[PDB]
């Protein structure tokens, strides 16, 4: 009911349609793409390319009157796992911003082909929040050391142009651009595609947190500052943050 | 038979002389660059240029009519061993197209000065094959995680251009750029440039394949793919690849 | 003595106070900087921001003079821990040219504003010498390892310009810049800040030199060379180097 599901030929368009929210994340959201990542060779298909309706790509997370919200951080890394997994390349068409829980789900894309008006960006250290380690190595390796760490120490937006510049944006074009490319790939040896994906996926990103990494990540999700942050945003005021 | 060897004072040039299959590699061609590396210091010499003759710098493999094709892995290993052995800095003098073997040959010199009309390119999403992990780090390293993502998974060319954009191209030049900077190197200190380039090499890129990617590898390598790649490829038409 | 310290609201501005050297590193500088780095938390700050005075950021060391000189490489140590431990994000404001030491020095900062007309450079080529492991890591971050190549190999140095497009300057601007910067930055959460700095210090640059390393490293910094370009440099002369 929150995705959409398309095939032409052999490319397989899977939609976020949740733009009352700008496709931010749910429980609901996660599970149903989970699932059509895992069933996307039923197929016939021989790439997917991932998008979202309207105006953003995925705004980052939503979990309000969503009933399985315990469950949805567990569920969000299912759906990592699924993608991870898939033999099939991941086009995704990021046709606007792309914040927090969606710059990863970008991130997690095989190629990505950005539209002129998208951004990304981790808001984290405006909420007081700590990042998992692949987010971090990820990012690293798309925008370069340099500028991921202005994007994680000071909130830094990524605008296209500069995602193209560094690799993030592997070309700058629209959902038909993306889908046009993802038809090309689908002509092209699936078990070359396989191998590849897996090696490029095993760099080195998908790292288990040190134990310090651990310490500080708990302190932070724990710490008043990101009630702090909440409260400041819904009273319409600036974060008065505490270091605690 | 197959190279030329010159040296003006203290840089030596070593030219791959196969033209008429725009440089393509075979054993002989392996065997005596190998040979040529390490004896370049006879030395004399403090710098090594590395070119090919006429249109391209190495346009891949050719092994029709080589004698000694069983062999030709081994050798090439061998050959990328000599290499990062050597303690003489390799200046790659990119000519024309680098690609496929030519594409590693060009990575493993230790700087590169690329002609405007040349580029890399490694196809192996068109034939059905797979690499090596340190063909798809150290392209990684020098393209970046997210252009590599596109070369491998879609066989996406990189521009002289581009490959300056990212550090692939250290210069836009000619081979008389490449000998006049290779002179220059070969007057900074040995010891200075062996520990650089020892450490820049130990980078982690010279990485043994997971269990996971020789399972991969050898899918691909042994697939019906790869021979309907080949037919397709004589028969003027367009490959239908299966997966398997 | 050596540096001066301020503090406009948030904001702790700390300045290297050697011009008459370009502010070359001494032991007495080096035990100011470490100094002053630890109290910064005195604080009330939650920015640091590094600078120098006048035309340059740090130009390498001057032990000239300086009593503490056979201390001065593990006092230079004890700064790179103090700065890596510090929980505040440290702004380097690199005004002019940052040489060897100070180039390390600027790539301890966690981010960079960089003038228009610094450069950056490590002449370790020319002096016959050999650098520590995470010297060429975070370069290699910072700059891909494309252009670290050649500023290793080659000394090749590393305008304002190409470092804004690699990422090792995050923005082109003046002191001014990177103090407002700054004061974004300590209006943002401390322990999200603290948690992505560790992380991504803890990227693997961070990086015991290996067994071959110490060996080269120490042929080097044995060798005659090192003491011919001491002498060349003195007598006004290009220097004759042996490669021992
Ligand atoms: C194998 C492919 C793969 C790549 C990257 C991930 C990332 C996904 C990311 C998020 F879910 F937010 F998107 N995210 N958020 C948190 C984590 C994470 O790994 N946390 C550590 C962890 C693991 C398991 C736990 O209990 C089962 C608890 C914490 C984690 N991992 C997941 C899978
Ligand atoms: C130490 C410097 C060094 C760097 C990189 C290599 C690359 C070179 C690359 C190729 F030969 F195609 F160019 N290439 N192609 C295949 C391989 C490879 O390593 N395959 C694994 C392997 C190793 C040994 C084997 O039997 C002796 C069999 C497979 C491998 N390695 C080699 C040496
Ligand atoms: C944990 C944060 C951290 C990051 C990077 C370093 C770098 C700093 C760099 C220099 F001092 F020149 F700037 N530099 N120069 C030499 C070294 C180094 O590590 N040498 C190996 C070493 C270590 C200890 C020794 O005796 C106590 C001797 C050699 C080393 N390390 C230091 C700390």
Same mark, same amino acid.
């Given at each position: 009911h929150m995705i959409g599901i398309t095939q032409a030929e052999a490319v397989l368009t899977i939609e976020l349609q949740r733009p009352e929210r700008r496709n931010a994340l749910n429980s609901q959201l996660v599970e149903e793409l989970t699932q059509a990542i895992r069933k @996307? =060779?039923? =197929?016939? @298909?021989?790439a997917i390319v991932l998008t979202g309706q309207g105006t953003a790509f995925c705004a980052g997370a939503d979990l309000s009157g969503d009933a399985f919200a315990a469950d949805y951080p567990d569920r969000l890394i299912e759906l990592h796992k699924a993608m991870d997994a898939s033999p099939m390349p991941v086009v995704g068409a990021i046709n606007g911003p792309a914040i927090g829980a969606g710059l990863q789900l970008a991130m997690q894309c095989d190629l990505r082909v950005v539209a002129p008006d998208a951004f990304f960006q981790f808001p984290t250290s405006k909420y007081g929040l700590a990042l998992d380690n692949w987010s971090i190595r990820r990012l690293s390796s798309l925008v370069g050391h340099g500028r991921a760490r202005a994007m994680l120490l000071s909130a830094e937006k990524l605008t296209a142009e500069i995602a193209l510049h560094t690799g993030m944006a592997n070309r700058i074009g629209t959902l038909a651009d993306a889908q046009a490319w993802a038809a090309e790939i689908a002509r092209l040896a699936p078990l070359a595609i396989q191998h590849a994906k897996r090696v490029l996926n095993d760099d080195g990103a998908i790292e288990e947190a040190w134990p310090a990494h651990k310490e500080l990540f708990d302190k932070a999700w724990g710490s008043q500052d990101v009630i702090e942050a909440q409260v400041a945003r819904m009273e319409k005021r600036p974060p008065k943050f505490q270091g605690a």
């Open positions: @996307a =060779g039923d =197929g016939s @298909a021989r």
